[PDB]
């Protein structure tokens, strides 16, 4: 039989997407932009515009619902104590820093910098849309990105509240009232749960705190050095941006018509022979919009599954202790 | 070579334009581009015209579409009141026409018809950028939760002396309504030639 | 009129209009069109 | 309500002309000769086929969502009803 | 079996005419002129 005489406290990172960028597509401005006869002919296709709008609105509401179910799990915002002493464990790297304009931790400051968003959906004062961009063209062609309900500050406050509740109450803050408990006793309860006697912790608290600090430092160094750590969120953002770019590029297609511009067809041909080209253009653009909506629905289902998994992992590993193997990282959680 | 149509005066800064037959609608602004002598029209990524050279004067003018934006209406139930709020998403209050028909600037859009308050309550109607509206129609930053702080200490512990046996409900769908659609009776009802033409579309 | 309308022509502009003039037989007026084949098309005058 | 609205939209899409002279098949068959009535019936056929395909795609997505929800519900049944689950916030908030 | 049936249905859909005179591309290319063959090539391309 083999029995270990020592142990190494390791910290492993796990990136899981919770939501994606919203999108609102106006069918009229996209297909029959600044056109009257095209807009009149578009009404003969039915409620496809309404179906697309309902699908996009459902996706937008579902993203916020997933974000709320993942981050907003507690009803109270617990604050960290002023004395940042927890028996040797240094949480300054994960606790929020009041010196920054945004109340985010030094680790979150790196996470928000490694991921670059294409369009967050903020206010555009029409001053940067002209003169000396892909986002501007998407907006002019009807593709509009909507901002999320919970801002980054609210997500950071929820994360800080969850962290404070954890480090101050063990697992009792999730099941009910936040019962205060010393951290060298929360760690003892964790060790007793994983099958290790508490005297090991009460004798090697210093070594365990040193190992935890070194692991946090190595995690910060890996997040600062390795750019592919947050590759999943960047890939999701890039997929959304590429979908928007493809949808705005599909307008360049002719779909068997004489020209991809509606005004050119209206000025070169009479209505009796221009309607047959307007119909082809409308059909092609509507098929492109339907394909985009189907792809967005599939991506929204994938994001919903990922967000449900992330919320389950949150409720199991953060708000409590999970005995499931390889669920809360590799090793005894 | 063009047609017998006469030219009109040039106006800059939302009018309809016609440059050598190229019809459209947008604003014209002094461009800083470097059009070549043999280049007359410009084209962006979306295959639209973003700049055009005037036939009379050799100056280059950018073509930018006029201001627009989504119009989201914020309204409570009809059985409660009839007053509504308008949210011009993506458009600033200093910029806001096709529609025939108390002002606060949010990060999601200009909100007209709601009074902003400093007090925070639970989010009733999700508006965007952390702002939520509720019923007059008021606007407020949504509250994340009740304020609470744990009295952590080196030798302080909390142990409950009582307990409450509560019951919580949880609704989860298991199935939905079945549907069987006959393509023939739906597309070519009581028609024979229509069915013969539909049979050519394969096994869809 | 291919690509243009016979009536909506006085409101457009052109780069360089070339007027091709030739006389062919009456029954031979079938190949004056894009993608046509025949004697006059393959040997005398072909349109793109 | 989503299933009902999908059925209502699918039965309403028959009112669309899809570029044809009329949405009624009998009207097109009685007003035009077959050589020019086939090209008008083809537009309606294509439109209704695209509507049916969109409805089937939406129903498949909803069926996948319902399958995920039913798997979650069966897991919750087997864990909370037929036993006792130690997973936090799984069998309701609190010590299950 | 579902993957195989999907592949077989996708390869069988080429037999459809989609309103054209024939499902074979070469038949349409050799029987009609380009002025009236594109209207069938477009239908075939759209269906496929």
PDB file of N, CA, C and O in Angstrom, chain A residues 43-93:
ATOM      1  N   UNK A  43     -43.562  43.132 -47.417  1.00  0.00           N
ATOM      2  CA  UNK A  43     -44.730  42.779 -46.620  1.00  0.00           C
ATOM      3  C   UNK A  43     -45.475  41.569 -47.167  1.00  0.00           C
ATOM      4  O   UNK A  43     -46.328  41.020 -46.462  1.00  0.00           O
ATOM      5  N   UNK A  44     -45.178  41.140 -48.393  1.00  0.00           N
ATOM      6  CA  UNK A  44     -45.842  39.986 -48.984  1.00  0.00           C
ATOM      7  C   UNK A  44     -45.248  38.659 -48.530  1.00  0.00           C
ATOM      8  O   UNK A  44     -45.781  37.606 -48.895  1.00  0.00           O
ATOM      9  N   UNK A  45     -44.167  38.681 -47.751  1.00  0.00           N
ATOM     10  CA  UNK A  45     -43.530  37.457 -47.283  1.00  0.00           C
ATOM     11  C   UNK A  45     -44.042  36.991 -45.928  1.00  0.00           C
ATOM     12  O   UNK A  45     -43.685  35.890 -45.497  1.00  0.00           O
ATOM     13  N   UNK A  46     -44.860  37.790 -45.249  1.00  0.00           N
ATOM     14  CA  UNK A  46     -45.439  37.372 -43.988  1.00  0.00           C
ATOM     15  C   UNK A  46     -44.763  37.957 -42.766  1.00  0.00           C
ATOM     16  O   UNK A  46     -44.243  39.077 -42.808  1.00  0.00           O
ATOM     17  N   UNK A  47     -44.767  37.202 -41.667  1.00  0.00           N
ATOM     18  CA  UNK A  47     -44.232  37.657 -40.390  1.00  0.00           C
ATOM     19  C   UNK A  47     -42.840  37.100 -40.109  1.00  0.00           C
ATOM     20  O   UNK A  47     -42.510  36.812 -38.954  1.00  0.00           O
ATOM     21  N   UNK A  48     -42.015  36.937 -41.145  1.00  0.00           N
ATOM     22  CA  UNK A  48     -40.645  36.483 -40.925  1.00  0.00           C
ATOM     23  C   UNK A  48     -39.845  37.519 -40.145  1.00  0.00           C
ATOM     24  O   UNK A  48     -39.013  37.166 -39.300  1.00  0.00           O
ATOM     25  N   UNK A  49     -40.086  38.804 -40.413  1.00  0.00           N
ATOM     26  CA  UNK A  49     -39.459  39.860 -39.624  1.00  0.00           C
ATOM     27  C   UNK A  49     -39.834  39.739 -38.152  1.00  0.00           C
ATOM     28  O   UNK A  49     -38.974  39.855 -37.270  1.00  0.00           O
ATOM     29  N   UNK A  50     -41.117  39.502 -37.869  1.00  0.00           N
ATOM     30  CA  UNK A  50     -41.560  39.372 -36.486  1.00  0.00           C
ATOM     31  C   UNK A  50     -40.964  38.130 -35.832  1.00  0.00           C
ATOM     32  O   UNK A  50     -40.592  38.164 -34.654  1.00  0.00           O
ATOM     33  N   UNK A  51     -40.861  37.030 -36.581  1.00  0.00           N
ATOM     34  CA  UNK A  51     -40.236  35.825 -36.041  1.00  0.00           C
ATOM     35  C   UNK A  51     -38.774  36.073 -35.692  1.00  0.00           C
ATOM     36  O   UNK A  51     -38.302  35.662 -34.624  1.00  0.00           O
ATOM     37  N   UNK A  52     -38.041  36.743 -36.584  1.00  0.00           N
ATOM     38  CA  UNK A  52     -36.640  37.055 -36.313  1.00  0.00           C
ATOM     39  C   UNK A  52     -36.503  37.969 -35.102  1.00  0.00           C
ATOM     40  O   UNK A  52     -35.621  37.765 -34.256  1.00  0.00           O
ATOM     41  N   UNK A  53     -37.368  38.982 -35.000  1.00  0.00           N
ATOM     42  CA  UNK A  53     -37.317  39.884 -33.853  1.00  0.00           C
ATOM     43  C   UNK A  53     -37.615  39.143 -32.556  1.00  0.00           C
ATOM     44  O   UNK A  53     -36.954  39.376 -31.537  1.00  0.00           O
ATOM     45  N   UNK A  54     -38.603  38.243 -32.574  1.00  0.00           N
ATOM     46  CA  UNK A  54     -38.920  37.473 -31.375  1.00  0.00           C
ATOM     47  C   UNK A  54     -37.767  36.561 -30.986  1.00  0.00           C
ATOM     48  O   UNK A  54     -37.450  36.423 -29.799  1.00  0.00           O
ATOM     49  N   UNK A  55     -37.122  35.930 -31.971  1.00  0.00           N
ATOM     50  CA  UNK A  55     -35.986  35.062 -31.672  1.00  0.00           C
ATOM     51  C   UNK A  55     -34.837  35.853 -31.060  1.00  0.00           C
ATOM     52  O   UNK A  55     -34.233  35.431 -30.063  1.00  0.00           O
ATOM     53  N   UNK A  56     -34.525  37.015 -31.640  1.00  0.00           N
ATOM     54  CA  UNK A  56     -33.434  37.830 -31.111  1.00  0.00           C
ATOM     55  C   UNK A  56     -33.759  38.354 -29.716  1.00  0.00           C
ATOM     56  O   UNK A  56     -32.884  38.390 -28.842  1.00  0.00           O
ATOM     57  N   UNK A  57     -35.012  38.754 -29.482  1.00  0.00           N
ATOM     58  CA  UNK A  57     -35.400  39.223 -28.156  1.00  0.00           C
ATOM     59  C   UNK A  57     -35.337  38.096 -27.134  1.00  0.00           C
ATOM     60  O   UNK A  57     -34.905  38.308 -25.994  1.00  0.00           O
ATOM     61  N   UNK A  58     -35.754  36.890 -27.525  1.00  0.00           N
ATOM     62  CA  UNK A  58     -35.641  35.756 -26.628  1.00  0.00           C
ATOM     63  C   UNK A  58     -34.203  35.433 -26.284  1.00  0.00           C
ATOM     64  O   UNK A  58     -33.883  35.138 -25.131  1.00  0.00           O
ATOM     65  N   UNK A  59     -33.312  35.500 -27.275  1.00  0.00           N
ATOM     66  CA  UNK A  59     -31.890  35.279 -27.009  1.00  0.00           C
ATOM     67  C   UNK A  59     -31.353  36.342 -26.057  1.00  0.00           C
ATOM     68  O   UNK A  59     -30.613  36.036 -25.112  1.00  0.00           O
ATOM     69  N   UNK A  60     -31.714  37.606 -26.293  1.00  0.00           N
ATOM     70  CA  UNK A  60     -31.224  38.689 -25.446  1.00  0.00           C
ATOM     71  C   UNK A  60     -31.711  38.539 -24.010  1.00  0.00           C
ATOM     72  O   UNK A  60     -30.957  38.786 -23.062  1.00  0.00           O
ATOM     73  N   UNK A  61     -32.971  38.136 -23.829  1.00  0.00           N
ATOM     74  CA  UNK A  61     -33.493  37.934 -22.481  1.00  0.00           C
ATOM     75  C   UNK A  61     -32.846  36.717 -21.831  1.00  0.00           C
ATOM     76  O   UNK A  61     -32.550  36.720 -20.629  1.00  0.00           O
ATOM     77  N   UNK A  62     -32.593  35.666 -22.616  1.00  0.00           N
ATOM     78  CA  UNK A  62     -32.011  34.449 -22.066  1.00  0.00           C
ATOM     79  C   UNK A  62     -30.570  34.662 -21.627  1.00  0.00           C
ATOM     80  O   UNK A  62     -30.129  34.047 -20.650  1.00  0.00           O
ATOM     81  N   UNK A  63     -29.823  35.522 -22.323  1.00  0.00           N
ATOM     82  CA  UNK A  63     -28.457  35.814 -21.893  1.00  0.00           C
ATOM     83  C   UNK A  63     -28.448  36.465 -20.514  1.00  0.00           C
ATOM     84  O   UNK A  63     -27.674  36.072 -19.629  1.00  0.00           O
ATOM     85  N   UNK A  64     -29.311  37.464 -20.310  1.00  0.00           N
ATOM     86  CA  UNK A  64     -29.403  38.109 -19.005  1.00  0.00           C
ATOM     87  C   UNK A  64     -29.917  37.144 -17.946  1.00  0.00           C
ATOM     88  O   UNK A  64     -29.481  37.194 -16.791  1.00  0.00           O
ATOM     89  N   UNK A  65     -30.841  36.255 -18.320  1.00  0.00           N
ATOM     90  CA  UNK A  65     -31.333  35.260 -17.370  1.00  0.00           C
ATOM     91  C   UNK A  65     -30.216  34.323 -16.931  1.00  0.00           C
ATOM     92  O   UNK A  65     -30.097  33.997 -15.744  1.00  0.00           O
ATOM     93  N   UNK A  66     -29.382  33.881 -17.876  1.00  0.00           N
ATOM     94  CA  UNK A  66     -28.257  33.020 -17.533  1.00  0.00           C
ATOM     95  C   UNK A  66     -27.254  33.752 -16.650  1.00  0.00           C
ATOM     96  O   UNK A  66     -26.745  33.184 -15.677  1.00  0.00           O
ATOM     97  N   UNK A  67     -26.958  35.013 -16.975  1.00  0.00           N
ATOM     98  CA  UNK A  67     -26.045  35.791 -16.143  1.00  0.00           C
ATOM     99  C   UNK A  67     -26.583  35.941 -14.724  1.00  0.00           C
ATOM    100  O   UNK A  67     -25.835  35.810 -13.747  1.00  0.00           O
ATOM    101  N   UNK A  68     -27.887  36.202 -14.593  1.00  0.00           N
ATOM    102  CA  UNK A  68     -28.496  36.341 -13.274  1.00  0.00           C
ATOM    103  C   UNK A  68     -28.459  35.026 -12.505  1.00  0.00           C
ATOM    104  O   UNK A  68     -28.179  35.014 -11.301  1.00  0.00           O
ATOM    105  N   UNK A  69     -28.737  33.908 -13.179  1.00  0.00           N
ATOM    106  CA  UNK A  69     -28.739  32.618 -12.498  1.00  0.00           C
ATOM    107  C   UNK A  69     -27.331  32.175 -12.122  1.00  0.00           C
ATOM    108  O   UNK A  69     -27.161  31.401 -11.172  1.00  0.00           O
ATOM    109  N   UNK A  70     -26.315  32.644 -12.845  1.00  0.00           N
ATOM    110  CA  UNK A  70     -24.947  32.241 -12.537  1.00  0.00           C
ATOM    111  C   UNK A  70     -24.361  33.108 -11.431  1.00  0.00           C
ATOM    112  O   UNK A  70     -23.838  32.598 -10.433  1.00  0.00           O
ATOM    113  N   UNK A  71     -24.439  34.431 -11.580  1.00  0.00           N
ATOM    114  CA  UNK A  71     -23.788  35.322 -10.625  1.00  0.00           C
ATOM    115  C   UNK A  71     -24.683  35.683  -9.446  1.00  0.00           C
ATOM    116  O   UNK A  71     -24.234  35.638  -8.297  1.00  0.00           O
ATOM    117  N   UNK A  72     -25.940  36.043  -9.702  1.00  0.00           N
ATOM    118  CA  UNK A  72     -26.853  36.462  -8.636  1.00  0.00           C
ATOM    119  C   UNK A  72     -27.512  35.233  -8.007  1.00  0.00           C
ATOM    120  O   UNK A  72     -28.659  34.879  -8.286  1.00  0.00           O
ATOM    121  N   UNK A  73     -26.749  34.579  -7.133  1.00  0.00           N
ATOM    122  CA  UNK A  73     -27.245  33.420  -6.404  1.00  0.00           C
ATOM    123  C   UNK A  73     -27.590  33.731  -4.954  1.00  0.00           C
ATOM    124  O   UNK A  73     -28.363  32.984  -4.342  1.00  0.00           O
ATOM    125  N   UNK A  74     -27.042  34.804  -4.395  1.00  0.00           N
ATOM    126  CA  UNK A  74     -27.329  35.206  -3.025  1.00  0.00           C
ATOM    127  C   UNK A  74     -28.139  36.495  -3.049  1.00  0.00           C
ATOM    128  O   UNK A  74     -28.125  37.259  -4.019  1.00  0.00           O
ATOM    129  N   UNK A  75     -28.860  36.733  -1.954  1.00  0.00           N
ATOM    130  CA  UNK A  75     -29.714  37.906  -1.820  1.00  0.00           C
ATOM    131  C   UNK A  75     -29.083  39.010  -0.985  1.00  0.00           C
ATOM    132  O   UNK A  75     -29.689  40.077  -0.838  1.00  0.00           O
ATOM    133  N   UNK A  76     -27.892  38.787  -0.437  1.00  0.00           N
ATOM    134  CA  UNK A  76     -27.208  39.776   0.384  1.00  0.00           C
ATOM    135  C   UNK A  76     -25.802  39.999  -0.151  1.00  0.00           C
ATOM    136  O   UNK A  76     -25.144  39.060  -0.607  1.00  0.00           O
ATOM    137  N   UNK A  77     -25.347  41.247  -0.090  1.00  0.00           N
ATOM    138  CA  UNK A  77     -24.024  41.633  -0.563  1.00  0.00           C
ATOM    139  C   UNK A  77     -23.115  41.706   0.660  1.00  0.00           C
ATOM    140  O   UNK A  77     -23.098  42.709   1.379  1.00  0.00           O
ATOM    141  N   UNK A  78     -22.362  40.636   0.900  1.00  0.00           N
ATOM    142  CA  UNK A  78     -21.461  40.582   2.044  1.00  0.00           C
ATOM    143  C   UNK A  78     -20.178  41.344   1.739  1.00  0.00           C
ATOM    144  O   UNK A  78     -19.591  41.186   0.665  1.00  0.00           O
ATOM    145  N   UNK A  79     -19.748  42.173   2.686  1.00  0.00           N
ATOM    146  CA  UNK A  79     -18.521  42.941   2.550  1.00  0.00           C
ATOM    147  C   UNK A  79     -17.382  42.261   3.299  1.00  0.00           C
ATOM    148  O   UNK A  79     -17.595  41.563   4.293  1.00  0.00           O
ATOM    149  N   UNK A  80     -16.164  42.475   2.807  1.00  0.00           N
ATOM    150  CA  UNK A  80     -14.994  41.920   3.459  1.00  0.00           C
ATOM    151  C   UNK A  80     -14.664  42.716   4.723  1.00  0.00           C
ATOM    152  O   UNK A  80     -14.866  43.934   4.772  1.00  0.00           O
ATOM    153  N   UNK A  81     -14.174  42.047   5.769  1.00  0.00           N
ATOM    154  CA  UNK A  81     -13.815  42.767   6.988  1.00  0.00           C
ATOM    155  C   UNK A  81     -12.659  43.716   6.736  1.00  0.00           C
ATOM    156  O   UNK A  81     -11.857  43.506   5.809  1.00  0.00           O
ATOM    157  N   UNK A  82     -12.532  44.780   7.532  1.00  0.00           N
ATOM    158  CA  UNK A  82     -11.412  45.713   7.322  1.00  0.00           C
ATOM    159  C   UNK A  82     -10.057  45.100   7.626  1.00  0.00           C
ATOM    160  O   UNK A  82      -9.068  45.467   6.982  1.00  0.00           O
ATOM    161  N   UNK A  83      -9.979  44.181   8.585  1.00  0.00           N
ATOM    162  CA  UNK A  83      -8.726  43.511   8.916  1.00  0.00           C
ATOM    163  C   UNK A  83      -8.552  42.342   7.952  1.00  0.00           C
ATOM    164  O   UNK A  83      -9.225  41.316   8.077  1.00  0.00           O
ATOM    165  N   UNK A  84      -7.646  42.494   6.986  1.00  0.00           N
ATOM    166  CA  UNK A  84      -7.416  41.476   5.962  1.00  0.00           C
ATOM    167  C   UNK A  84      -6.431  40.415   6.465  1.00  0.00           C
ATOM    168  O   UNK A  84      -5.366  40.183   5.894  1.00  0.00           O
ATOM    169  N   UNK A  85      -6.813  39.767   7.562  1.00  0.00           N
ATOM    170  CA  UNK A  85      -6.036  38.687   8.156  1.00  0.00           C
ATOM    171  C   UNK A  85      -6.935  37.468   8.301  1.00  0.00           C
ATOM    172  O   UNK A  85      -7.999  37.547   8.925  1.00  0.00           O
ATOM    173  N   UNK A  86      -6.507  36.346   7.728  1.00  0.00           N
ATOM    174  CA  UNK A  86      -7.271  35.104   7.750  1.00  0.00           C
ATOM    175  C   UNK A  86      -6.376  33.930   8.121  1.00  0.00           C
ATOM    176  O   UNK A  86      -6.439  32.858   7.511  1.00  0.00           O
ATOM    177  N   UNK A  87      -5.529  34.114   9.130  1.00  0.00           N
ATOM    178  CA  UNK A  87      -4.663  33.042   9.581  1.00  0.00           C
ATOM    179  C   UNK A  87      -3.481  32.764   8.682  1.00  0.00           C
ATOM    180  O   UNK A  87      -2.996  31.629   8.643  1.00  0.00           O
ATOM    181  N   UNK A  88      -3.000  33.771   7.955  1.00  0.00           N
ATOM    182  CA  UNK A  88      -1.869  33.627   7.070  1.00  0.00           C
ATOM    183  C   UNK A  88      -2.220  33.577   5.598  1.00  0.00           C
ATOM    184  O   UNK A  88      -1.354  33.851   4.759  1.00  0.00           O
ATOM    185  N   UNK A  89      -3.462  33.234   5.262  1.00  0.00           N
ATOM    186  CA  UNK A  89      -3.886  33.174   3.871  1.00  0.00           C
ATOM    187  C   UNK A  89      -4.076  34.583   3.324  1.00  0.00           C
ATOM    188  O   UNK A  89      -4.819  35.386   3.897  1.00  0.00           O
ATOM    189  N   UNK A  90      -3.403  34.880   2.216  1.00  0.00           N
ATOM    190  CA  UNK A  90      -3.433  36.202   1.602  1.00  0.00           C
ATOM    191  C   UNK A  90      -4.439  36.184   0.456  1.00  0.00           C
ATOM    192  O   UNK A  90      -4.213  35.530  -0.567  1.00  0.00           O
ATOM    193  N   UNK A  91      -5.549  36.903   0.630  1.00  0.00           N
ATOM    194  CA  UNK A  91      -6.589  37.000  -0.386  1.00  0.00           C
ATOM    195  C   UNK A  91      -6.582  38.349  -1.095  1.00  0.00           C
ATOM    196  O   UNK A  91      -7.565  38.702  -1.755  1.00  0.00           O
ATOM    197  N   UNK A  92      -5.492  39.112  -0.975  1.00  0.00           N
ATOM    198  CA  UNK A  92      -5.441  40.430  -1.600  1.00  0.00           C
ATOM    199  C   UNK A  92      -5.480  40.340  -3.118  1.00  0.00           C
ATOM    200  O   UNK A  92      -5.901  41.293  -3.783  1.00  0.00           O
ATOM    201  N   UNK A  93      -5.053  39.211  -3.685  1.00  0.00           N
ATOM    202  CA  UNK A  93      -5.071  39.041  -5.131  1.00  0.00           C
ATOM    203  C   UNK A  93      -6.467  38.771  -5.674  1.00  0.00           C
ATOM    204  O   UNK A  93      -6.710  39.006  -6.863  1.00  0.00           O
TER     205      UNK A  93
END
